[PDB]
Every structure is written in structure tokens, then in C-alpha cells.
């Protein structure tokens, strides 16, 4: 089944060969983790890296850029805590905006900040470019 995404520089799956592609089945879950790193355990990074994770069009993923009023999945403000978000590739959700996945469409999750409390609210390719911090979602037909 689906492997959790540890969203920090330590991940390494980001700047690998294929470049972090996931093939979610309809029904699968996906957990995005921004791990502690303050009282540092495994999976955590050198220091705390400040990120906002956006779910994005695909063409927008390429451009490493997220639209105004983006689909914000996970804000990473808390170096003390572990933070996680969970999507089930499914029709119902606690989300009130009513987005949707299409057929044969690629989507991306991206981080467009530079990893710093100050450059956090940036919407154009930050770590997305710098650390290849984008994951591709190709969802079952």
C-alpha cells in the first residue's frame, strides 16, 4: 500500500531518479508528515524546515507555482510537535471547498516556501525548485 511522505530535506526520495511519483489507488490513504525535529528522532531533519504543502493542478506543479487561494493541505509552524495530514482518495471529505480529482490527470503536492518562517507564505517555486520538493500523484483510472 501507500508509503507516508516525510516532508523535510532529510527525505531524499525528493531528489532521486524518477522524482517522487505516487500511484494512489481509489480508496487509498496518504499521510503527509512534518516530524518533530526539535527533540529530534529519526525521519526528522538537521533543523526545523518551515513549509506549506499545496495540492496543485499538475501544469502548476511543473511551473512550481500554486494559485491564489491555493489548496493548502498542511502548514508546518510547530517544531515542537509532529504534524500530519491524511487524504483518502474518495468522494467524501471534511473539506468544505469541494475540489476533485479527475481521470488521467496528474496532480502535484508542492512546497513553494524557502524553508524559513519568513518566506513561508511564498507561492512560487521555493524548495519546489531548490530541493525538488514536489510529489506527483497519478490516481487509479
Amino acid at each position: 500500500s501507500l508509503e507516508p511522505v516525510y516532508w523535510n530535506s532529510a527525505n531524499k526520495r525528493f531528489q532521486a531518479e524518477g522524482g517522487y511519483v505516487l500511484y494512489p489507488q481509489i480508496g487509498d490513504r496518504l499521510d503527509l508528515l512534518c516530524p518533530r525535529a526539535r527533540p529530534p528522532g529519526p525521519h526528522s531533519s538537521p533543523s526545523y524546515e518551515f513549509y506549506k504543502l499545496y495540492l496543485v493542478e499538475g501544469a502548476q506543479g511543473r511551473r512550481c507555482e500554486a494559485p491564489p487561494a491555493p489548496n493548502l493541505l498542511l502548514t508546518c509552524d510547530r517544531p515542537d510537535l509532529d504534524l500530519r495530514f491524511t487524504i483518502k482518495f474518495q468522494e467524501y471529505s471534511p473539506n468544505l471547498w469541494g475540489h476533485e480529482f479527475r481521470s488521467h490527470h496528474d496532480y502535484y503536492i508542492i512546497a513553494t516556501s524557502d524553508g524559513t518562517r519568513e518566506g513561508l507564505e511564498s507561492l512560487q517555486g521555493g524548495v519546489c525548485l531548490t530541493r525538488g520538493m514536489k510529489v506527483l500523484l497519478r490516481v487509479g483510472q
Binding site: 493541505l73 502548514t75 515542537d80 491524511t86 468522494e91 471534511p94 468544505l96
Partner: protein, 428 residues
């Protein structure tokens, strides 16, 4: 074959926290016939009940439930009868489809006198919530006979276009919730006020940060609209409709009190055991169940249960169990019907997941105790808005819950109906 409102002193119910499967839900959907070719999704559900009658509504889609194309709007009523089994079941008697399915939103229903009254928003700019600034504020009321006469002229079906609207400091005003109550000849609909953000009056220091590092005093105020920058803020309340205020009676918005204040959400006001209770869905940081007895109506004040066991799935910011004031807008509507006032026990269908819309569990509960429960389906069964209503059948307590439910890979997605008798014995 009459179902009756939950009144007086019904039979005994188990008052003991137990693990025995005393709860035995039944599926009774069938008596509400629903067709739809594959890839049809039936949503925006509404169920209401009063005096052995029900209102019902759904939006039939083709495609996703979220964005799929509106094919039709059902708005119907009928009676709640004994199916001969000594089991409660719904029976349609009167249905009405609106010309353009794309124009009607956020319907709300209350019963009075052989008539259900369904008050909807009318919008040509989409969901009035998502496009707040561009909505007419336009409302509409339909009135269906619960027992249609073999043709009379205005009896069975009738429409009012809603001319005047006492809305105070609120720009726009609309029904926001499944059902309300009648008070003699006055209808009260769950509703919501649109107030220009700038004119929102809030002492940021009333925000409960007091045990919450990371929560900033500004959070409560910002979480009073769908976005921090949003033009309006939402204030839940009631919309009053006086049937004796002439042929063209006015609707009056009554704001909810500023006690334990969340962003305006879809809400319910209902009669249990001779006094109105009020539920408000939790669509931001205050994620524990918000309901409780109605102290007074026209100054609207609600005595919020101090519950510590019932919640809903959110997303990452405000997931199930979150109590700290964060700035967010997310959640689901799983309401709860009071069944015992002496001991304050309520019944509902809740989703046993933190950030996910799955696992509907019919649970009977008190402020700080879940007594008993019953899984409606499997661990990974998908579920969303749930609507619970309780009544009597031969002085025995029954609940009917409408549950947005499917498990991945069925052809037509649609809500199901569960009848759930409440057990007297705590044992077998």
C-alpha cells in the same frame, strides 16, 4: 400505524455504559425509492420529521459529489408509518422537482399544519457560501401537503417568493440547516447571517488561548469567516416566519448568542421531550459536539452541553478532538438527537476517523461517557453528513438516521436510511 413525537415518559432505555451489542440497526432505505444510472451521485441531503411526517431533499449529480453536474433536485414529504413489522419506515406522498436544479440551495424544513414548509436560497452564482458577495440574498418558500388532496388548487403545492426580510446589521441572510421547529404558528428555521467583516465586533482577548501555545488571540475572529481575508463573517441563528402575519408574512433573522461562538454552520433546532434543543455543526477549531437545551428563542441562547466524547473529522489544522483556537474552516455535519433529558443521553451517527470521512458509528452518549454504540458498516466505509431524528412507536424510542454512505467501487453513490430501536435491557 402512527409514529409520535418523543414526548412525556417513554419506556426505559439502558442507562449503563456497556459493550454488549444491544443496538441492532436496520436498513430501511428501500421505502424511499431512489434510481440513478452508474456514475450518479446523490447528495446535499435533508431529512426532517415532526408528528409522524417527514421532509426530504437531495441533489442528484452526474460525476463527482463535489463538482459533478446537477441533474435534478428532489423535494418531497410523506408520512412515517409502522410498516406492519412494528418497525418505523418512511412513505412518500408528495414530491416536487424545481425547474432548474442549479438554482436552489441550503433548503430547510419545518412542519406545522398538514404542511411542511421548505425554505431555500435561490442563487444563479452558485453556492451562496462560496460566492458570498455575488448572491442576491434571494430566498424562496415551498409548502407541501403531507397528505395531498386529490387536487384542490394550491393545497398540495404552493410557492411564496419572500418579499420582506428583517435582517438587521446583516447584509444577506439565509436558511442553513436540515430542519427547525414550529411554535404555535411561528416557524423557526436554522439560518445564517452574512455580516461585513469590518463591522464584526469582537474583543480578540475573548479568544481561549490560555492553554494553547501556537494559538494567537486573533484566531477566533479570523475563523468566523470561510477565509481569514473573507468579506463576510457567518453567524448562525434562526429565521422566524409568522404564518399569521398576513398573506405576505416577513422572515426575521435572530442571531445566536456569542456563547461558545463558532463560525456560522449548518445547524438544527428540534423538540425533544417538551423543550427545544439546538445543534450547530463544528466547522472550525471548536470540534467537540455543540448542542444543548434552548433557554430562550427570540433572544437566541443555547445551553451548550459540556461534552468531552463526541467530535468530527476535520483536516490537518482542526482534526477530530481539536479544542485550541486555530484559524480554519472544515468539518462535517453529524447531528445528535436528545433521547433522555433527566440523564442527558443523546443518539447520533458519528465518523470514527480523525481527518477522514469514513466509519459511521451509531453512538448513544452522555457528556463524558459513550454508553453503547453500533458500527453501521466496515472500518473503511465512506460516510459524510449524518442526520438523526428520534420518536416513539408504541411508547418505544426509535431513531432514524440518514447517512451519506458508500464503500469504494459501488456504481451509484447515495445516502442510506437506518432505523435503530433504543434498547430497554442492558444485556442480550
Amino acid at each position: 400505524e402512527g409514529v409520535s413525537n418523543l414526548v412525556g415518559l417513554p419506556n426505559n432505555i439502558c442507562l449503563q455504559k456497556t459493550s454488549n451489542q444491544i443496538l441492532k440497526p436496520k436498513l430501511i432505505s428501500y421505502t424511499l425509492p431512489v434510481v440513478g444510472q452508474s456514475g450518479t451521485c446523490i447528495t446535499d441531503p435533508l431529512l426532517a420529521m415532526d408528528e409522524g411526517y417527514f421532509a426530504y431533499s437531495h441533489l442528484e449529480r452526474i460525476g463527482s459529489c463535489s463538482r459533478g453536474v446537477s441533474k435534478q433536485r428532489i423535494i418531497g414529504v410523506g408520512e412515517v408509518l409502522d410498516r406492519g413489522d412494528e418497525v418505523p419506515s418512511l412513505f412518500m406522498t408528495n414530491v416536487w422537482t424545481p425547474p432548474n436544479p442549479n438554482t436552489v440551495y441550503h433548503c430547510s424544513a419545518v412542519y406545522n399544519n398538514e404542511f411542511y414548509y421548505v425554505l431555500c436560497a435561490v442563487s444563479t452564482v452558485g453556492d451562496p457560501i462560496l460566492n458570498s458577495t455575488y448572491w442576491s440574498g434571494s430566498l424562496m418558500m415551498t409548502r407541501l401537503a403531507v397528505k395531498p388532496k386529490s387536487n384542490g388548487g394550491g393545497y398540495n403545492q404552493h410557492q411564496l417568493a419572500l418579499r420582506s426580510i428583517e435582517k438587521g446589521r446583516y447584509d444577506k441572510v439565509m436558511p442553513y440547516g436540515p430542519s427547525g421547529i414550529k411554535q404555535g404558528d411561528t416557524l423557526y428555521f436554522p439560518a445564517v447571517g452574512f455580516l461585513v467583516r469590518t463591522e464584526f465586533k469582537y474583543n480578540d482577548s475573548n479568544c481561549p488561548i490560555t492553554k494553547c501555545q501556537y494559538s494567537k488571540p486573533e484566531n477566533c475572529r479570523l475563523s468566523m469567516g470561510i477565509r481569514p481575508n473573507s468579506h463576510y463573517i457567518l453567524r448562525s441563528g434562526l429565521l422566524k416566519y409568522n404564518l399569521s402575519d398576513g398573506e405576505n408574512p416577513k422572515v426575521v433573522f435572530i442571531e445566536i448568542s456569542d456563547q461558545r461562538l463558532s463560525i456560522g454552520s449548518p445547524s438544527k433546532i428540534y423538540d425533544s421531550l417538551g423543550q427545544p434543543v439546538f445543534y450547530q455543526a463544528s466547522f472550525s477549531w471548536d470540534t467537540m459536539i455543540k448542542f444543548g437545551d434552548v433557554l430562550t428563542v427570540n433572544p437566541l441562547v443555547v445551553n451548550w452541553r459540556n461534552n468531552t466524547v463526541i467530535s468530527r473529522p476535520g483536516q490537518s489544522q482542526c482534526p477530530r478532538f481539536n479544542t485550541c483556537p486555530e484559524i480554519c474552516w472544515e468539518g462535517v455535519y453529524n447531528d445528535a438527537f436528545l433521547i433522555d433529558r433527566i440523564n442527558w443521553i443523546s443518539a447520533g451517527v458519528f465518523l470514527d476517523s480523525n481527518q477522514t470521512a469514513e466509519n459511521p458509528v451509531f453512538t448513544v452518549f452522555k457528556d463524558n461517557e459513550i454508553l453503547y454504540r453500533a458500527q453501521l458498516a466496515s472500518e473503511d466505509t465512506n460516510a459524510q453528513k449524518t442526520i438523526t431524528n428520534c420518536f416513539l412507536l408504541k411508547n418505544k424510542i426509535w431513531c432514524i438516521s440518514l447517512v451519506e454512505i458508500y464503500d469504494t467501487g459501488d456504481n451509484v453513490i447515495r445516502p442510506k436510511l437506518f432505523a435503530v430501536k433504543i434498547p430497554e435491557q442492558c444485556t442480550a
